[PDB]
């Protein structure tokens, strides 16, 4: 299924992903389109930040939800 | 267009430059480093600047050596990323003088290349920029770039690699900006965010007879369009680091002091230009200037040109 | 007679000054008339900055000159 990211720059992509794709698998779709390495990515979906080891499924995001990208903090 | 995104591992070297010497006050201040070429050898300091500049203050916390700081050298590395970039598009790259140009390098190059731009000032002491306050403060850069790298980057830059990169970090007297295109792409990273606090004058006509502006100078390497391209690339990172943005006004360039040729050359090659100014903003200013992931988090929100494009593999 | 001070944004004053006046006295009617401190003070003129204990005249400044001035952050 189609779903869609806000980049750092706000620009959207589109993904293409499986309701079983962990949240690791959807970071690394995200470094092969966009270059950004996973270890810099936190992804948001309706408030909350998404947590590698679970599934899109987990969180209930559905085919056309938005997914917002932001930096993951190294506290410094 | 696709992002410019720094490397992991130079992250946190910046981490470690900002931690050591950008977040430090300037030493060479105060009584001792006040300058009058009148009585020239009267104090410590051969020349003005050392009391300019040294801290501004953001809700009560200063923040240090703000015109060259943690959002002044990090802009930089996201320049040399687009430059090498718009030289593999180049039919004809510039040479310099190893044979080699910019579009030789590879990522790996570009990565190494990051670490030392990290380093380029580090060394400054005060806003002294006279010859040999300029030759000093990059000597210390260099050799604080030689010891971190020789206690945690040996995996990645050999002994060679280390003097080479101190070298280009040191910038010697006798040796040329284009010797190598590792050396050439730092200085003209560098030279880009001059716009941030130099007049129109250098930025357009050129400083003395004989040089070349900034603007023309990236126009001759890069062609009309993506030097303009780079330029406006470095306006929108000012302006989400907080920076006063410049007004570019070229009607005003005859009124300047400057030479009648010099205005001419600056106008065939750059054409008519009229550009709005912003002022500066006390909050974005002190979001980059106080962290790693301030700074970072506000140059990855600028849209880059959009011919920009990185090989993945 | 009266020269033009710019800051980069392109926010103008005009001084009342003299040939021989130095830069340093310069930048105290600077400080006079806008509150900015003499060490917040990096003035230009036709591509060079200045030192304080030159004058005007040194740079060859006349009436109706234009000087730049690089302040950082009004309020800093
Ligand atoms: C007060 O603050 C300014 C800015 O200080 P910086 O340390 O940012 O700048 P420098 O004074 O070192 O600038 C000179 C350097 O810029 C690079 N440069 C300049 N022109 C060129 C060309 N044409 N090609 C390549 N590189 C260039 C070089 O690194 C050069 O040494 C300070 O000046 C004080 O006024």
Redesign the interface.
């Known amino acids: 299924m189609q779903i869609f990211v806000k980049?750092?720059?706000?620009?959207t992509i589109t993904l293409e992903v499986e309701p079983s794709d962990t949240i690791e698998n959807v970071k690394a779709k995200i470094?092969?389109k966009?270059?950004?390495?996973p270890?810099?990515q936190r992804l948001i979906f309706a408030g909350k930040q998404l947590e590698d080891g679970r599934t899109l499924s987990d969180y209930n995001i559905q085919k056309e939800s938005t997914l917002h990208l932001v930096?993951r903090?190294?506290?410094? | 267009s696709?992002?410019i995104?720094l490397?992991?591992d130079v992250?946190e070297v910046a981490?470690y430059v900002?931690?050591t010497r950008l977040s430090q006050p300037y030493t060479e201040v105060g009584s001792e480093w006040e300058?009058?070429?009148?009585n020239p050898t009267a104090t410590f300091a051969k020349?003005?600047?050392h009391?300019?500049?040294?801290y501004?203050?953001?809700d009560g916390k200063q923040?240090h050596r703000?015109?060259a700081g943690l959002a002044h050298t990090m802009r930089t590395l996201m320049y040399s990323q687009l430059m090498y970039c718009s030289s593999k598009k180049q039919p004809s790259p510039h040479v310099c003088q190893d044979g080699r140009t910019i579009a030789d390098l590879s990522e790996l190059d570009l990565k190494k290349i990051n670490i030392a731009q990290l380093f380029f000032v580090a060394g400054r002491e005060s806003?002294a920029?006279y010859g040999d306050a300029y030759h000093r403060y990059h000597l210390y850069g260099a050799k604080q770039f030689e010891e971190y790298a020789r206690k945690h980057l040996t995996h990645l830059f050999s002994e060679e690699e280390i003097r080479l990169y101190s070298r280009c970090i040191e910038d010697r007297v006798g040796d040329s900006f284009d010797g190598t295109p590792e050396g050439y792409i730092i200085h003209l990273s560098h030279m880009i965010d001059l716009m941030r606090?130099?007049?129109?004058?250098?930025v357009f006509?050129?400083?003395?007879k004989g040089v070349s502006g900034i603007v023309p100078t990236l126009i001759h390497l890069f062609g009309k369009q993506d030097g303009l391209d780079i330029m406006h690339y470095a306006r929108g990172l000012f302006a989400a680091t907080?920076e006063?943005?410049?007004?570019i006004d070229s009607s005003?360039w005859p009124?300047?002091?400057?030479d009648l040729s010099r205005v001419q050359r600056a106008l065939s090659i750059v054409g008519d230009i009229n550009v709005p100014?912003?002022?500066?903003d006390?909050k974005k200013?002190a979001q980059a200037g106080f962290?790693?992931?301030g700074c970072?988090?506000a140059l990855?929100?600028?849209?880059?040109p959009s011919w920009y494009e990185?090989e993945?593999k």
Do not use: F, W
């Open positions: 980049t750092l720059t706000g620009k470094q092969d966009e270059g950004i390495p270890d810099q930096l903090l190294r506290g410094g | 696709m992002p995104i490397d992991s992250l981490e900002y931690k300058y009058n070429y009148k020349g003005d600047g009391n300019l500049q040294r501004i203050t953001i923040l703000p015109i806003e920029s606090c130099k007049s129109p004058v250098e006509l050129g400083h003395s907080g006063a943005v410049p007004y005003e009124h300047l002091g400057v100014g912003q002022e500066a006390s200013t962290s790693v992931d970072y988090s990855t929100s600028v849209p880059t990185k993945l």
